[PDB]
From a paper:
Proteins attached to the surface of group A and group B streptococcal human pathogens that contain tandemly arrayed Rib domains have been associated with invasive infections and proposed as potential vaccine candidates. Here, we study Rib domains from Rib, R28, and from a surface protein from Lactobacillus acidophilus. Together, these 5 structures of homologous Rib domains, and further sequence analyses, show Rib is an example of domain atrophy, a rare event in domain structural evolution involving the loss of core secondary structure elements, and also reveal the remarkable structural malleability of this domain family. The structure, molecular dynamics simulations, and small angle X-ray scattering of a Rib domain pair suggest tandemly arrayed domains are likely to form an elongated rod on the bacterial cell surface, thus suggesting a possible mechanism of immune evasion mediated through domain number variation.
We hypothesized that some members of the Rib domain that have long insertions in the position of the characteristic Rib D-E strand atrophy may retain the full Ig fold and thus represent something akin to the ancestral form of the atrophied Rib domain. Thus, we solved the structure of “Rib Long” (RibL) (residues 1165 to 1268) and “Rib Standard” (RibS) (residues 1269 to 1329) at resolutions of 1.07 Å and 1.25 Å, respectively. As predicted, the Ig-fold D/E strands missing from RibR and R28N are also missing from RibS but are present in the RibL structure. Thus, RibL comprises a full Ig-like fold which likely represents the ancestral state of the Rib domain, and RibS is an example of evolutionarily recent domain atrophy from RibL; this is remarkable because there are very few cases where we have the structure of both atrophied and nonatrophied domains that are closely related in sequence. RibS belongs to the “Rib” subfamily, giving a Cα rmsd value of 0.6 Å for superposition with both RibR and RibR28N, versus a Cα rmsd of 2.3 Å for RibL. A longer Rib domain contains the full Ig fold and likely represents an ancestral preatrophy structure, thus providing a rare example of a closely related pair of structures of an atrophied domain with its ancestral form. In the atrophy of the Ig-like RibL, a significant loss of the structure (∼20% compared to RibR/RibS) is involved, but the domains remain thermostable with melting temperatures (Tms) of 78 °C and 88 °C for RibL and RibS, respectively, and 71 °C for RibR. As Rib (RibR, R28N, and RibS), RibL, and aRib form 3 distinct Rib subfamilies, this begins to shed light on the evolutionary pathway of a fold where an ancestral Ig-like fold (RibL) has lost core secondary structures (RibR) and diversified in structure (aRib).
Author numbering: 1163 to 1268
Write the structure that this text describes.
């Protein structure tokens, strides 16, 4: 079998909308080359882009995203990246859209 594990997986994160002082958690979903749900391979590792906000964290083993903007964080949108490394050393860059909403009043 030729190719890379990355060719057979398509991790995805739902959009995040979070107010200052909230904590939201997002589990990546995943589909195969045919578009059908599939589990991410065990041993896959996850790392946020080092330029991502300090208040976005990515579980290194599971890829779960914890988004916890402090009080005082400005409202606004962010387009961030998570690097996925499969156990064969292949990689994917996976985006997440993170909106910080106003604390009280949209």
């Amino acid at each position: 079998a030729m190719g890379q594990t990355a060719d057979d997986h398509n991790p995805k994160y739902e959009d995040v909308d979070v107010k200052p002082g909230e904590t939201n958690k997002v589990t990546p979903t995943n589909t195969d080359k045919d578009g059908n749900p599939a589990n991410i391979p065990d041993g896959t590792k996850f790392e946020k882009d080092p330029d991502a906000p300090s208040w976005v964290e990515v579980d290194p083993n599971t890829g779960e995203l914890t988004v916890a903007p402090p009080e005082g964080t400005p409202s606004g949108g962010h387009e961030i990246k998570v690097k996925v490394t499969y156990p064969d050393g292949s990689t994917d860059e996976v985006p997440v859209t993170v909106k910080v909403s106003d604390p009280t009043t949209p």
